[PDB]
Amino acid sequence: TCPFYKKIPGTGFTVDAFQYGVVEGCTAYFLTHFHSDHYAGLSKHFTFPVYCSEITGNLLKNKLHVQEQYIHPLPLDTECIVNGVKVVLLDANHCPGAVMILFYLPNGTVILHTGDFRADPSMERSLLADQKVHMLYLDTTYCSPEYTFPSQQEVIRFAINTAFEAVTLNPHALVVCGTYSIGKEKVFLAIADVLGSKVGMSQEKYKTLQCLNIPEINSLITTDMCSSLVHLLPMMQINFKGLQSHLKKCGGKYNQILAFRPTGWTHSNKFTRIADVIPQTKGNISIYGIPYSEHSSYLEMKRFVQWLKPQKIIPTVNVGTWKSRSTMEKYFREWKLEAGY
Numbered sequence: 001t002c003p004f005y006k007k008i009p010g011t012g013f014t015v016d017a018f019q020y021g022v023v024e025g026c027t028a029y030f031l032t033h034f035h036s037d038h039y040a041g042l043s044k045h046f047t048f049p050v051y052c053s054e055i056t057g058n059l060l061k062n063k064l065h066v067q068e069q070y071i072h073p074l075p076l077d078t079e080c081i082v083n084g085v086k087v088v089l090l091d092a093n094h095c096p097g098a099v100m101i102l103f104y105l106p107n108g109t110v111i112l113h114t115g116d117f118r119a120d121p122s123m124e125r126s127l128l129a130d131q132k133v134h135m136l137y138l139d140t141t142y143c144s145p146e147y148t149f150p151s152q153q154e155v156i157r158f159a160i161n162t163a164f165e166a167v168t169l170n171p172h173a174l175v176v177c178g179t180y181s182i183g184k185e186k187v188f189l190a191i192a193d194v195l196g197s198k199v200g201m202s203q204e205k206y207k208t209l210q211c212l213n214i215p216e217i218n219s220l221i222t223t224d225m226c227s228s229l230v231h232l233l234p235m236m237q238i239n240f241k242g243l244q245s246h247l248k249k250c251g252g253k254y255n256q257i258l259a260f261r262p263t264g265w266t267h268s269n270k271f272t273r274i275a276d277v278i279p280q281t282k283g284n285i286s287i288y289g290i291p292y293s294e295h296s297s298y299l300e301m302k303r304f305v306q307w308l309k310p311q312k313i314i315p316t317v318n319v320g321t322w323k324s325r326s327t328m329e330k331y332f333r334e335w336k337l338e339a340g341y
């Protein structure tokens with residue numbers, strides 16, 4: 001059964017609610033982004049309207065085979081009428097095609113559902129600036145002060161300079177980057193660009209990348225693994241066993257692997273600056289864990305919410321324990337008292 005925080009009161013609408021069968025009263029199902037926890041239950045057999053971004057729509061059609069007649073893509077930053085209700089989609093600064101959704105309820109209430117997001121000051125100059133929001137359904141993934149990490153730009157700077165230095169010292173090194181879903185594409189694209197290489201990968205990953213509207217993509221990726229010195233592999237294979245095995249397959253073309261595992265936050269963020277990160281090493285294989293986040297840090301989230309000044313907040317992540325829920329409610333009250341709303 002569909003939980004309350006995925007329902008939009010006073011509409012026939014649900015958000016990210018595909019794993020509960022036919023939801024009673026739901027006339028339209030919104031999908032914020034193409035990550036499996038959110039799309040769970042969609043397939044070629046789905047026969048209700050789905051509303052989403054153009055990119056999300058390409059992925060529904062090609063990867064899950066959802067029939068065309070049921071995919072309703074909407075342009076961003078544009079007031080749209082869906083089943084008699086005004087809605088807008090805003091960029092979530094998450095993975096490709098991820099949106100936030102503003103709902104203008106018939107009774108005068110305004111609701112923002114962030115989906116998954118990484119808050120940014122640039123959001124303070126979207127169509128959010130124009131008016132008041134009564135209810136905020138908030139991505140609270142890292143809603144605690146210990147959750148600190150660098151900007152995406154600094155993390156990419158570290159990876160580019162690390163990769164360039166290694167391959168310039170040894171032209172026979174191979175670079176590997178881990179992946180398990182869309183998002184974080186800048187990691188492997190930035191490294192391949194500095195090295196003058198295309199990124200090699202499986203046919204299934206190439207297919208997924210081809211759905212994402214990235215400019216010049218045909219120039220950047222390839223399924224010919226042999227022509228490429230940046231390879232993508234599933235995240236599970238980024239370990240000393242999996243990388244040893246991979247190196248054997250390359251036919252004595254390479255004599256070293258430098259590999260990256262983009263993670264979210266890890267506890268080594270509590271002690272170590274990005275500059276000071278070191279790899280794990282075994283023989284001719286090194287592995288760097290790098291904290292590239294597509295979710296708000298604590299400070300980024302607090303800034304957004306204190307700017308928005310919502311009347312009520314409903315968390316959508318970490319809602320399963322009493323301790324979590326209590327902790328998040330304490331932070332929301334501090335924020336409100338500090339800012340005066």
Ligand code: NI
Pocket residue numbers: 033035094116
């Ligand atoms: Ni996500």
